[PDB]
Design an enzyme around this catalytic site. Structure first.
Site, short mmCIF file in Angstrom:
data_model
loop_
_atom_site.label_atom_id
_atom_site.label_comp_id
_atom_site.label_asym_id
_atom_site.label_seq_id
_atom_site.Cartn_x
_atom_site.Cartn_y
_atom_site.Cartn_z
N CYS A 1 88.83 -71.90 -59.51
CA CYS A 1 87.43 -72.18 -60.06
C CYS A 1 87.70 -73.03 -61.30
O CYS A 1 87.67 -72.53 -62.43
CB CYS A 1 86.62 -70.88 -60.39
SG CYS A 1 87.61 -69.65 -59.57
N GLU A 126 84.42 -75.08 -55.30
CA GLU A 126 85.69 -74.53 -54.77
C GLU A 126 86.14 -75.43 -53.63
O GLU A 126 85.26 -75.94 -52.89
CB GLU A 126 85.53 -73.07 -54.37
CG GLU A 126 86.34 -72.16 -55.28
CD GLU A 126 86.02 -70.68 -55.27
OE1 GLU A 126 85.46 -70.18 -54.25
OE2 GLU A 126 86.37 -70.01 -56.27
#
EC number: 4.-.-.-
Length: 258
Positions: A1, A126
């Site tokens: 992330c 992501e």
DNA sequence: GTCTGG
DNA sequence: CCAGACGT
DNA sequence: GTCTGG
DNA sequence: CCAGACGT
């Protein structure tokens, strides 16, 4: 992330952060360093993002349930760092695993001083690893939203900001300058919903109860606070184009579906 | 500044 | 004790 | 393969 | 996070 979107004009962001203090007063968070707010569809580590933190970090004798909003550097620079420039840091403080956080020198000290913040974002990106290809599919991941220039403007006015558990530290440059405020985003195991995208996700605080308890280092101990840190299934996503991949690309096509 | 490894 | 890391 | 810059 | 360099 290691990428987010946070594109909203500053006043639209501030109205999306309307909250109630412990006494039930409807408030908007007070700004510090609003000139460092740099809206973009494509935020990488070492950029500034707005975070919420308790008024009590800035004002003596304050209601710890009151909120400040401030830009902070993504990538925690510990108080003790000795080199002249933040960018000479030889370890990764973009994220902070929740399981190990009490045993990590970089995170334990600041968490122990109540330096708990809430990282704001439209949502986060992501990149999915697929067996036997180096190709990676980007996704945009965000809270479920209430279901044309009139369509767009309406959606972003009524957008629910993603609220992520962070820890922050303060660093006096040795050479001199303003105190650097920097944050890490806490990670947890991905939920079933996200497991086929990536095994790890940000610690998402879902609702004003959770946001308030994480901010309130006045009334809420570290032990109590760490109980708010866990996966959530209250999450949705869609695949996006490769335009996001290069951080220099700041456009709406970054979070457009395909 | 603090803590693990030697 | 000091050296050396301090993170995903 | 690794690390800096964005 | 990925892109892009990696040297005198």
């Amino acid at each position: 992330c290691g990428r987010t979107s946070c594109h909203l004009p500053r006043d639209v962001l501030t109205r999306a952060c309307a909250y109630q203090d412990r006494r039930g007063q409807q408030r908007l968070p007070e700004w510090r360093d609003p000139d460092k707010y740099c809206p973009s569809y494509n935020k990488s580590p070492q950029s500034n993002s707005p975070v919420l933190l308790s008024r009590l970090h800035f004002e003596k004798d304050a209601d710890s349930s009151e909120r400040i909003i401030a830009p902070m550097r993504w990538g925690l620079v510990p108080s003790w760092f000795k080199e002249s420039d933040p960018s000479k840091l030889q370890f990764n403080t973009t994220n902070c695993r929740s399981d190990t956080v009490m045993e990590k020198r970089s995170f334990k000290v600041p968490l122990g001083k109540g330096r708990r913040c809430v990282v704001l974002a439209d949502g986060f990106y992501e990149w999915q690893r697929c067996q036997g290809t180096n190709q990676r599919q980007p996704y945009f991941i965000y809270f479920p939203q209430i279901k044309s220039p009139e369509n767009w403007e309406k959606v972003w006015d009524n957008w629910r900001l993603l609220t992520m558990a962070g820890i922050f530290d303060c660093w006096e440059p040795p050479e001199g300058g303003d105190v650097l405020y920097s944050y890490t985003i806490i990670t947890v195991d991905s939920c079933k919903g996200l497991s086929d995208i990536h095994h790890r996700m940000p610690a998402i605080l879902d609702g004003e109860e959770a946001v308030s308890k994480w901010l309130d280092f006045g009334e809420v101990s570290t032990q109590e606070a760490l109980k708010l840190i866990h996966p959530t299934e209250n999450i949705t996503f869609h695949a996006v184009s490769s335009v996001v991949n290069n951080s220099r690309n700041n456009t709406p096509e970054c979070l457009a579906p395909v």
